[PDB]
Amino acid sequence: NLPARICRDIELFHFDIGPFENMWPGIFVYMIHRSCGTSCFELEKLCRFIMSVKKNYRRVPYHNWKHAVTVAHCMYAILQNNNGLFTDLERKGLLIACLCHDLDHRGFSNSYLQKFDHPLAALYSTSTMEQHHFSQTVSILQLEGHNIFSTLSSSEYEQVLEIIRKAIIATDLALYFGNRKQLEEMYQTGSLNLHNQSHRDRVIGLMMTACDLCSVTKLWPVTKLTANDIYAEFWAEGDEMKKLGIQPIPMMDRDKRDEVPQGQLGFYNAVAIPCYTTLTQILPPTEPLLKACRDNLNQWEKVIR
Numbered sequence: 059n060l061p062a063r064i065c066r067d068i069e070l071f072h073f074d075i076g077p078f079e080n081m082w083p084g085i086f087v088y089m090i091h092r093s094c095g096t097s098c099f100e101l102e103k104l105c106r107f108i109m110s111v112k113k114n115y116r117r118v119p120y121h122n123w124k125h126a127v128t129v130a131h132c133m134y135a136i137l138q139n140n141n142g143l144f145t146d147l148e149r150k151g152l153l154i155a156c157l158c159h160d161l162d163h164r165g166f167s168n169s170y171l172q173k174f175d176h177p178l179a180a181l182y183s184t185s186t187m188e189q190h191h192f193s194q195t196v197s198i199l200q201l202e203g204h205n206i207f208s209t210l211s212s213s214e215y216e217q218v219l220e221i222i223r224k225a226i227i228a229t230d231l232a233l234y235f236g237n238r239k240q241l242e243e244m245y246q247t248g249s250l251n252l253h254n255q256s257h258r259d260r261v262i263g264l265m266m267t268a269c270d271l272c273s274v275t276k277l278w279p280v281t282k283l284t285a286n287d288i289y290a291e292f293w294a295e296g297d298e299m300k301k302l303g304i305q306p307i308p309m310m311d312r313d314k315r316d317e318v319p320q321g322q323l324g325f326y327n328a329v330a331i332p333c334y335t336t337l338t339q340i341l342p343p344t345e346p347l348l349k350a351c352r353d354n355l356n357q358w359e360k361v362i363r
């Protein structure tokens with residue numbers, strides 16, 4: 059059962075899930091129980107599922123099991139602070155989607171898989187890794203005793219899997235730019251309609267981006283340390299690009315590491331700030347994410363000065 063400090067602090071947008079890996083499954087179950095009810099899933103099935111998901115995350119620097127639970131926590135915080143907006147099915151689906159959204163990640167981008175001519179790029183030409191993450195999700199659900207959705211009707215099963223698929227695919231950051239552009243237009247013209255499924259899907263897409271990127275919404279010590287892990291992957295990919303005979307983009311080139319503060323500035327400006335700004339416009343209770351993002355932006359500016 060959850061420690062008093064965790065029960066309190068888990069409700070903060072900037073909660074960090076800690077270094078104790080064995081505690082993370084219980085943290086996830088607690089979040090499920092609080093958003094979805096303790097009758098939502100059979101506990102044994104749920105526990106079995108979570109442990110098989112863990113097993114299919116790799117020991118990479120950033121796109122790992124810790125990332126999965128962290129993304130799920132951010133989703134929990136959004137859902138908790140936006141009571142009555144999302145359906146029981148959406149809430150279950152979105153939390154499970156976040157837990158599964160990077161399944162079997164190798165620590166390489168879609169672009170690298172394409173340049174490598176990896177068999178996954180042949181199977182899934184666009185959003186390669188994300189299509190794979192969804193495939194892994196389905197495969198796990200299909201294992202004996204793992205169908206946490208077995209109490210749903212056939213129709214609800216299909217429905218939740220579609221919610222999950224859309225949510226996982228939305229974590230392809232390539233898609234964020236177009237999605238955010240559409241949403242911002244809908245906001246400003248007052249045409250955003252949460253009862254319109256296509257609009258609803260976009261909002262959920264943006265939520266998935268917000269959650270995926272949430273390391274930039276933590277307090278500075280957490281954010282600064284996390285940046286070490288993301289670049290560890292990117293620089294390794296840069297090395298691999300060099301080995302293919304291809305000059306990596308500066309973000310992936312360890313030789314350009316002194317330029318990290320300027321690169322961060324670019325990212326906050328082009329992606330992070332616009333993301334949380336748009337999210338806050340649609341879901342005002344999510345403002346703490348934007349506040350923390352702006353604070354981290356200032357810290358990078360301070361590093362530069």
Ligand SMILES: c1ccc2nc(COc3ccc(-c4n[nH]cc4-c4ccncc4)cc3)ccc2c1
Nearest residue numbers: 273284285288308309314315317318321322325
């Ligand atoms: C030289 C040196 C560094 C450079 N960096 C950049 C942009 O760097 C990033 C880093 C991470 C991410 C990111 N993508 N998805 C989640 C994250 C993330 C996760 C945790 N913390 C920060 C970002 C996006 C951009 C550009 C040019 C550069 C040139």
Ligand SMILES: [Mg+2]
Nearest residue numbers: 159160229230
């Ligand atoms: Mg991903």
Ligand SMILES: [Zn+2]
Nearest residue numbers: 159160229270
């Ligand atoms: Zn992710």
